[PDB]
Design a protein around this nucleic acid. Structure first.
Ligand SMILES: [Mg+2]
Ligand SMILES: [Mg+2]
Ligand SMILES: [Mg+2]
Ligand SMILES: [Mg+2]
Ligand SMILES: [Mg+2]
Ligand SMILES: [Mg+2]
Ligand SMILES: [Mg+2]
Ligand SMILES: [Mg+2]
Ligand SMILES: [Mg+2]
Lengths: 117, 51, 150
RNA sequence: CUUGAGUCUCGUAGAGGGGGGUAGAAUUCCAGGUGUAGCGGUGAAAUGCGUAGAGAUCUGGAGGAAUACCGGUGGCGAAGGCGGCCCCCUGGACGAAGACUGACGCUCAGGUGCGAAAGCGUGGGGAGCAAACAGGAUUAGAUACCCUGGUAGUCCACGCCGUAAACGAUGUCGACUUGGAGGUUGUGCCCUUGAGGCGUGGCUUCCGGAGCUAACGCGUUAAGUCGACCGCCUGGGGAGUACGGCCGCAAGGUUAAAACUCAAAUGAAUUGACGGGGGCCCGCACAAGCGGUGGAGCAUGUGGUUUAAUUCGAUGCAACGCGA
């Protein structure tokens, strides 16, 4: 509705869910879409496919924003982390620079115990 | 990691990503530390590396 | 199990010389009554041919087209998790399943005599109407919705 | 007297120690911009957080703890233990040539001091994790494992506590005893013409011979062959318990029995069996299909119930149209 012609694509590929938020280079959320919020839940929403079917739905918003091309901001493991890209890259959206913003602490915080079964 | 390609051919080149960061330095920290497991469990790798 | 069979060849349609159409008679063939059975196969087969205008084997495959499953899910118990991993079905299996469904559904179509059941239910498939075409699509829905595993 | 020990000169490497700085990565929190209906979590969930606008995303800021990569069979240390970088104060180990003192050594009950973590005191600090505790789920139950929160504590300063599978489960010092492979750092030499090659010291992994061992195994870093000194063991349970002494703020530590009771307890290795161990296979075992049972009427066998008697026997798969 403002025609930005281009922005950036954020992907929060978590181990349980994946979400894609397209925003102008400034960092202002233009349009977002999440796997879970796309029907399938639990086991199904945490699959690679889920990210794709969900991601494509994000473009269904940030596209009518004049957007032509965009970058890639991937962080965290889990599926879709790679899938999400192809969706956009193939959704006509001209790609450009793929970057892995995945955080990596040089040893600072102590992770939680948990997981013990 | 940073990656920019010239000419639209659609190639991820996800190499530079997993060629260092990604999992490992992540999957390792995904859950509670080791505290003891490193000075031992981790040092038992040679028990396999030696042969 | 670990064996390696080949293919139990069948008498190519006892009236059209078509192996494919032949087994179709075997499916409906019950209690070794290959005679009484096939007698119901051709009747509804020729009837539908006369009604559809085109030959039996024609409307046969045609109506079968809408009953041919392209893919299906399979059970795989790997670690207490019984995932229904989907996977496309080979050719011979595709048509095979179809014929089975057609008969099964026809046998309980609820008409008066099998002749009508088979024939009538055979047409419904040609235009995607009877359970035949339904099962196919219903099964395809299992997949895709499970394609995450695929 | 000089080979033991030590002193000097000169270098050698180092997460060795005390103190003070300091950088970047991330976490959480606060503020605001953008944006909208989810997020989070699991095996599923649910609690929980979201329209009072979360999550995601961007900007600024607050703070605490820990230093990815280098990094290892690595290095240092008496032991515990010790990892970013910078400086300051500081201890030890090693080689080199020699110069020097001249047996000044080794060991050591008691004694002295150092001592992981948890814990205790006072006063600070507090992001993340997390006993307790609180919900939610699981279950027959589940005061647990799992999820959502979360206090002590963890961090700091000074003091206390002295324990650990404080482990190489292997006291210290010295001397001899075939080898092979590799890491670490010092030093002598070689067209150094090279990292290349040869030697020769300290340390350290791995394999292993002789011999030792109950066997497993150890093996010039011994558990081999000897010497000097010390500590400790004398069946299992009761029991590192009681009592008393000492120590302690306390939690408790330490020294340390008896009655009674059993004929074992124990080490290693062997064979087999089993594993919600692993690898490779087979059977209509599964999957792939067709038809059945379980519902129905009746036959029939069986338990039961009854009976004067309901003759006796078969009662996981291997009993129940079975001996009949
Ligand atoms: Mg918890
Ligand atoms: Mg402490
Ligand atoms: Mg305290
Ligand atoms: Mg050492
Ligand atoms: Mg050996
Ligand atoms: Mg034993
Ligand atoms: Mg067989
Ligand atoms: Mg079966
Ligand atoms: Mg059936």
């Amino acid at each position: 509705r403002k025609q930005v012609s281009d922005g950036v694509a954020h992907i929060h590929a978590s181990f349980n869910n994946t979400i894609v938020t397209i925003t102008d280079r400034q960092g202002n959320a233009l349009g977002w879409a999440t796997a879970g919020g796309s029907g399938f839940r639990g086991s199904r929403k945490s699959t690679p496919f889920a990210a794709q079917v969900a991601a494509e739905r994000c473009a269904d918003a940030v596209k009518e924003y004049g957007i032509k091309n965009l970058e890639v901001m991937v962080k965290g493991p889990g599926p879709g982390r790679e899938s999400t890209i192809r969706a956009l890259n193939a959704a006509g959206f001209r790609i450009t620079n793929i970057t892995d913003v995945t955080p990596i602490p040089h040893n600072g915080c102590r992770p939680p115990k948990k997981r013990r079964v | 990691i940073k990656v920019r390609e010239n000419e639209p051919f659609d190639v991820a080149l996800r190499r530079f990503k997993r060629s260092c960061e990604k999992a490992g330095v992540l999957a390792e920290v995904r859950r509670r530390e080791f505290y003891e497991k490193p000075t031992t469990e981790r040092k038992r790798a040679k028990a396999s590396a030696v042969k | 199990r670990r064996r390696v069979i080949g293919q139990r060849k069948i008498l190519p349609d006892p009236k059209f010389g078509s192996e494919l159409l032949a087994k179709f008679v075997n499916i409906l063939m019950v209690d070794g009554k290959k005679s009484t059975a096939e007698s119901i196969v051709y009747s509804a087969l020729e009837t539908l041919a006369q009604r559809s205008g085109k030959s039996e084997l024609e409307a046969f495959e045609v109506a079968l087209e809408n009953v041919r499953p392209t893919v299906e899910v399979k059970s795989r118990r790997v670690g207490g998790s019984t995932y229904q991993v989907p996977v496309e079905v080979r050719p011979v299996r595709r048509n095979a399943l179809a014929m089975r469904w057609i008969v099964e559904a026809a046998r309980k179509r609820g008409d008066k005599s099998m002749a009508l059941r088979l024939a009538n239910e055979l047409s419904d498939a040609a235009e995607n109407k009877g359970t035949a075409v339904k099962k196919r699509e219903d099964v395809h829905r299992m997949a895709e919705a499970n394609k995450a595993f695929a």
